Design a protein around this ligand. Structure first.
Ligand SMILES: NC(=O)C1=CN([C@@H]2O[C@H](COP(=O)(O)OP(=O)(O)OC[C@H]3O[C@@H](n4cnc5c(N)ncnc54)[C@H](OP(=O)(O)O)[C@@H]3O)[C@@H](O)[C@H]2O)C=CC1
Ligand SMILES: NC(=O)C1=CN([C@@H]2O[C@H](COP(=O)(O)OP(=O)(O)OC[C@H]3O[C@@H](n4cnc5c(N)ncnc54)[C@H](OP(=O)(O)O)[C@@H]3O)[C@@H](O)[C@H]2O)C=CC1
Ligand SMILES: CC1(C)N=C(N)N=C(N)N1OCCCN(Cc1ccccc1)c1ccc(Cl)cc1
Ligand SMILES: CC1(C)N=C(N)N=C(N)N1OCCCN(Cc1ccccc1)c1ccc(Cl)cc1
Ligand SMILES: O=c1ccn([C@H]2C[C@H](O)[C@@H](COP(=O)(O)O)O2)c(=O)[nH]1
Ligand SMILES: O=c1ccn([C@H]2C[C@H](O)[C@@H](COP(=O)(O)O)O2)c(=O)[nH]1
Ligand code: MET
Lengths: 532, 531
């Protein structure tokens, strides 16, 4: 087909347009405004644009030339193709585009109307003629909307390098609705921040609808048991989309790939109640908090409850009623008469959760009495101490906050799942490890990622640091049997660019945050999944 | 040369021989004994030798069809000396799916078995390959055949199995000329028929590709050569960098050292000492397949085994160790060091409520290293053992030394924060979270300690040890270890040893130093980590 021989790709960038919100991939569709771009600079998009439209590989040229010659019977650079208004949006000092063979479609304008060193063509068949005559690597359609429309309805695009700008702007022109039958996404990049917006890079593909060391690889894999056994009784063919992607570089896939790993390779166990899980042991996930807030996109997540849990912890509280009166039910089941009695806490009042996270963070080692006691200057204020070590001894390898008080375990409603946070400071940035002994991949983890990411931002702010990495170590990583079906749905979804977290900048002590100091901007997500 | 053109390869397997001793590649030489192999059956090698000698690639034969004939079902060639031929029994003859050559100057094709081949002098092969259609030519020994093939530089690659046990031998492999061949791949380590083994690859020295440009675009925001912050010199690790396949588990430790040296943050800890630092790693070692005692330098375990026994007894008394010449904690018990920790009222070598005390007495008011603490505080060690036996699917099997109440009273706060255990199908795994990781001195020992512990816990619980999982928090190279580790990165690991515990010990409290034995430890020379 014409676009496979001449290697004609589209590259574009689309913001969200000003229209319980439904999100699909038509969410990213805004192209330009009043004949320019809807944003000022997004330098990372330019850097990427520059990299795709200028990259050439001379070794691959020999096969492209042959291929092209065969379909015709018979310093290397790429061609870029522009609508006239696209071309007129470009600052003069940057035209023609350096190190690229510039082509401009126009009727109003002819060869004579240009000083530059550009090919002017009347019409699309004129690009195909030209490409049969030029030595060039790849041909990229640079827009705008009219050029994009005509190139897709002529089935002349092999791939779309589509940048998702995860902010909203005023737009007067739009990228056409991509037909899912015609194009599927095969690759999704890492998520970055540039110019106060997150973005990622996705690739749509035209649909179906020394090399002795090649061999040493196979010799060296001689003992591998699983040769399509169905190790666990989940069917790869149900993860069609998940498996069809080639480059899964969105950080959400750090979480998604562990659910794949647990499902394909998990050990079958009957846990605390008889419920049943697949389980694995030891994983690490790293999220770049300077580039995004890793709220999972492949299902809807509300953070009001877990933000109010984090503030409850920081205040040192163990009173389950405080959450209940803010309509947060996170701890309700763990405070019942029955639940407490079955934990042999017969002398513990309903919703008095005992010496849990808050108590240990502000008072580790004090004798716990009841949820209403004044524990001032009793036991160790770990939280205060770790803020003090970040500020005054940032290179310490001893900045840990530990919830696992061995003496108090049996007196807690339940022993903590988030065992400990360690902190690390280099060059004015704060990174955090949280070690989780016990990890519900379907229900718990996605919230836990959020709690500790928010907490790291908070500790960074009050210490006058920027956040860097939030690092999540999973000990006992389990998927409950009755989550599996929901999880196979979620895995076949393709993540959206992460949102961002904004903390009220004025809060300077860790104690001084409230619910209104927390804003999640630009949360684009698939619909909610009931995991059960 | 003949060899690089015609793809002439040697597959062999060499054990150690029955000769404070020193190791090199020529440690592994034993080939045969009394016209048979020196060992009963090592079936993971039998399997390897099958997969390697059968397998062929249709696609890639093209670049050979026109190269050996640009010089003058597609099976594989195997050559063997008659005694290597008759050394094997009959049901296997002639090795299925393989052009069975033999190197005999005596008995001809009418003498011998099936519809195979023969030659009579070394040269007489040179042209036989030039005739028939074949993927690659494998020399299966024996010593005599290998010997005369390495003399005449006809061997492109050697596919050499290191059998890491000792056997009676009569025949050996040639010393591999270190300047004439170099190792370019090393496999995972495996247990098989009560011995560890790995597979290494020697080479002759010289003195849908659209989705491939998408990879370059996704790397658009990565980093070049002033980026990759290196006053380290990559070219100083030629051997580390020349390996294609680095599958030996020691590479889990080595790769972290390379990562820290190359991408490490320069920081100036306490003193002005200087480190390169990163945050958050996870290594995993299969205790069922080997004992992960680093082989790229010499490690001693008596001291760290005594330390472990000392922990299990609940001791905090530094003198107990000093009287056994284990001096791991000596610096942390001086009047000077205690005074600088603001512990002016602590006896010298009274290390305070450290590992032992937290493991057997968590929450007990520490008094001094001589007090009787029986049935005071939480015996976590007894508890986590009773959890493994009574409730193995529990996700609460944690052994934690980081008592926040007691940190200031400790000579120093622990590096090893906690162990977590996991039991599946009668097998025990252990995660240890290390807050502070000296990759050059500490970590090598810390792996051995907690590997040993895992074996101890597993055995007193009648489980097989599975994985030790080492999670590193603040991982640092001391700046002055850099020269030594560069030397260390350029050493090819040896197949790991094994650990044998005295099987009689079924109480964690009942181990003594003589119940621990390391077997077949083959290691490069000791390295002083500075100077
Ligand atoms: N976000 C992004 O990735 C991109 C955004 N943009 C934005 O897009 C907008 C411009 O798009 P839009 O207004 O649709 O216009 P275009 O940039 O697509 O240019 C349209 C003009 O191109 C010429 N033309 C197009 N097709 C043909 C053809 N087949 N034969 C001959 N001439 C042809 C005509 O020029 P003439 O009128 O002289 O005959 C036509 O008026 C701006 O806002 C721009 O900044 C630009 C590209 C990429
Ligand atoms: N561990 C390992 O990797 C392996 C080692 N072995 C072991 O090795 C031992 C046998 O090896 P080894 O003693 O070296 O004997 P070989 O198996 O190497 O057989 C060599 C024979 O080939 C003939 N021959 C030797 N040199 C030449 C030559 N230049 N030209 C032509 N023919 C020649 C001779 O047979 P003749 O003159 O009688 O015709 C000679 O006896 C056994 O213990 C066996 O189990 C076996 C397989 C692999
Ligand atoms: C730049 C942009 C939006 N990014 C992607 N990913 N895909 C595109 N097609 N893009 O538009 C390219 C249009 C050309 N352009 C339009 C432009 C750029 C800046 C300001 C106004 C208009 C430009 C100008 C200068 C240089 Cl050096 C390179 C490209
Ligand atoms: C088997 C061995 C040692 N494996 C490696 N890695 N390197 C070699 N070249 N080997 O030599 C194999 C030669 C003969 N042999 C070894 C043998 C077997 C039984 C008793 C003595 C020797 C054999 C028998 C059956 C089969 Cl299917 C394949 C090889
Ligand atoms: O913050 C939390 C709290 C709980 N859990 C899950 C993990 C287990 O499924 C269960 C805890 O049960 P135990 O591991 O304590 O038995 O709750 C989480 O994932 N995150
Ligand atoms: O078992 C141990 C004890 C110490 N260290 C290293 C880490 C640091 O270099 C130093 C401990 O000092 P702090 O991290 O507590 O400052 O020793 C280890 O790697 N392992
Ligand atoms: C009524 S319980 C079953 C609901 C399930 N989580 C769906 O999917």
């Amino acid at each position: 087909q014409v676009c496979d021989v001449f290697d004609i790709y589209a590259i574009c960038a689309c913001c969200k347009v000003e229209s319980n919100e439904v999100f699909n991939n038509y969410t990213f569709r805004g192209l330009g405004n009043k004949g320019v771009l809807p944003w000022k600079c997004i330098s990372l998009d330019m850097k990427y644009f520059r990299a795709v439209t200028t990259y050439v590989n001379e070794s691959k040229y020999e096969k492209l030339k042959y291929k092209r010659c065969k379909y015709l019977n018979k310093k290397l650079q790429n061609v870029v193709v522009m609508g006239r208004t696209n071309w007129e949006s470009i600052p003069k000092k940057f035209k023609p585009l350096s190190n690229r063979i510039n082509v401009i479609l126009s009727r109003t304008l002819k060869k004579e109307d240009f000083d530059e060193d550009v090919y002017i063509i009347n019409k699309v068949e004129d690009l195909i003629v030209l490409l049969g005559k030029l030595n060039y690597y790849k041909c990229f359609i640079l827009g705008g909307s009219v050029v994009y429309q005509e190139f897709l309805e002529k089935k002349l695009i092999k791939k779309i390098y589509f940048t998702r700008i995860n902010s909203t702007y005023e737009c007067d022109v739009f990228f056409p609705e991509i037909n899912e039958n015609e194009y599927q996404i095969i690759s999704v990049s890492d998520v970055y921040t540039s110019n106060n917006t997150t973005l990622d890079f996705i690739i749509y593909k035209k649909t179906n609808n020394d090399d002795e060391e090649e061999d040493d690889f196979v010799y060296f894999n001689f003992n591998k048991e699983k040769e399509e056994k169905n190790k666990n009784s989940i069917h790869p063919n149900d993860f069609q989309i998940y498996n069809s992607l080639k480059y899964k570089y969105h950080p959400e896939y750090q979480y998604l790939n562990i659910i794949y790993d647990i499902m394909m390779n998990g050990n079958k166990q009957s846990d605390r109640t008889g419920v049943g899980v697949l389980s694995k042991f030891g994983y690490i996930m790293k999220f770049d908090l300077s580039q995004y807030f890793p709220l999972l996109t492949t299902k809807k997540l509300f953070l009001r409850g877990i933000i109010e849990e984090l503030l409850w912890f920081i205040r040192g509280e163990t009173n389950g009623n405080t959450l209940l009166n803010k309509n947060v039910r996170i701890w309700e089941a763990n405070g019942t008469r029955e639940f407490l009695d079955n934990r042999k806490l017969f002398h513990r009042e309903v919703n008095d959760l005992g010496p849990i996270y808050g108590f240990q963070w502000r008072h580790f080692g004090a004798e716990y009495t009841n949820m209403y006691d004044n524990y001032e200057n009793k036991g160790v204020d770990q939280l205060k101490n770790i803020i003090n070590l970040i500020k005054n001894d940032p290179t310490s390898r001893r900045i840990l906050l530990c919830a696992w008080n061995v003496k108090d375990l049996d007196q807690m409603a339940l022993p903590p799942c988030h065992i400990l946070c360690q902190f690390y400071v280099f060059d004015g940035k704060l990174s955090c490890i949280m070690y989780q002994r016990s990890c519900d991949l379907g229900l718990g983890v996605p919230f836990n990622i959020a709690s500790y990411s928010i907490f790291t931002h908070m500790i960074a702010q009050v210490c006058n640091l920027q956040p860097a990495q939030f690092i999540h170590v999973l000990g006992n990583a389990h998927v409950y049997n009755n989550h599996i079906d929901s999880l196979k749905i979620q895995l076949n979804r393709i993540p959206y660019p992460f949102p961002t977290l904004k903390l009220n900048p004025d809060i300077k002590n860790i104690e001084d945050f409230t619910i209104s100091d927390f804003t999640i901007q630009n949360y684009v997500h698939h619909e909610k999944i009931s995991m059960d």
